Design a protein around this ligand. Sequence first.
Ligand code: HEM
Ligand SMILES: CSc1ccc(C(=O)O)cc1
Ligand SMILES: [Cl-]
Length: 393
Amino acid sequence: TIPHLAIDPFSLDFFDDPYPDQQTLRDAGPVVYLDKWNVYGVARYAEVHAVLNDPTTFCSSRGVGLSDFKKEKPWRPPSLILEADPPAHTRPRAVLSKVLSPATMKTIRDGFAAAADAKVDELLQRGCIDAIADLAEAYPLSVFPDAMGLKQEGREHLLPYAGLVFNAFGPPNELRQTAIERSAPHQAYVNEQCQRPNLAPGGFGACIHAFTDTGEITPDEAPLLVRSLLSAGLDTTVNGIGAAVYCLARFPGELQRLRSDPTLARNAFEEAVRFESPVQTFFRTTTREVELGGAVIGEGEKVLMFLGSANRDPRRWSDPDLYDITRKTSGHVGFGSGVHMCVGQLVARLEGEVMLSALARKVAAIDIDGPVKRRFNNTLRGLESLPVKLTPA
Ligand code: HEM
Ligand SMILES: CSc1ccc(C(=O)O)cc1
Ligand SMILES: [Cl-]
């Protein structure tokens, strides 16, 4: 009933060009079995969306990577939110909700926007730049660690620590095993910065600590919740902004539309999240026997959701393979869906909007001007290097 496939969705060849294999996965059936990792797979929008929206049946507390926490030790203490199920999930979620809230966005926006304009201005002085190191990485690094309230010393650990986290969701391939081997100093830095004394007042970090007297979280939960933001908060936005620039770079027609109406900046970002889906994949674990798309999955099985595939499913999207900054993106699963839907999406969108606004107002063209180099990671899709020539408007 369930087709078995030998595709390794965590292989360098798959990362290098996932799209044919992803159609192969959708078209094989609503539910496949991946013999490489002994794992159920769902690659169509409908089943990915269903799975995300039944947290009772498809739980996150047994881990959202390949590893099943009921079978193996987690490589670090479990996240209090990503790797928890309702009701444990609920209050720490509420806290990060209020911390990364509309009101908070109102306090950081001018600063984020200024940073974004200043960067684009700086890059136009150079002309030929690396849209990854000098933009996708540099810009979030200029705003997010400050927004967190991190001290300056040690920030080089942040992107290493993130690549470790996302690699560690993957199978025990060499990417994962090499990440964990190198992890010790990045863990030490991050863990130390999660303690209240090390976070500057007014920041996301000290804000999380300040929420520890309401009955929602206790003081011993706050460091791990800060850890959550230093795990998820940065590298995701680097690959999100990287994606958007790359799309603009490959669809000049859409850059020209964006320039003509910079208010499209925020949706231009949302479409780049759908189109590239920087967060490619996550697992759930079945807490019971379940019928899904007319196939039956037993208790305790890992189910792999192909978010990027879901976002290019021609069953859901018209011309999924086109970058369209005026598309109605509502319902894309690049930020997830349901009770775990990205609690940090207002920061990502803010960062993404203000950067694409800056480009929209200041840049006339973005032409790839050198070898594009992909960066391989078990969960993240994105580029190592994107050399572009920026033409001033
Ligand atoms: C382009 C940027 C981003 C993308 C594509 C993204 C993607 C995602 C996805 C797909 C999920 C769902 C995980 C699941 O269902 O298991 C999620 C949850 C989460 N994200 Fe984001 N994210 C982004 C930005 C951010 C930022 C800026 C932050 C923090 C400042 C953040 C923090 C979190 C946290 C803590 C969770 C766990 C929420 C929960 O379990 O309820 N993310 N993200
Ligand atoms: C969806 S990416 C991500 C989200 C949350 C955490 C965490 O809670 O540490 C890590 C990665
Ligand atoms: Cl850690």
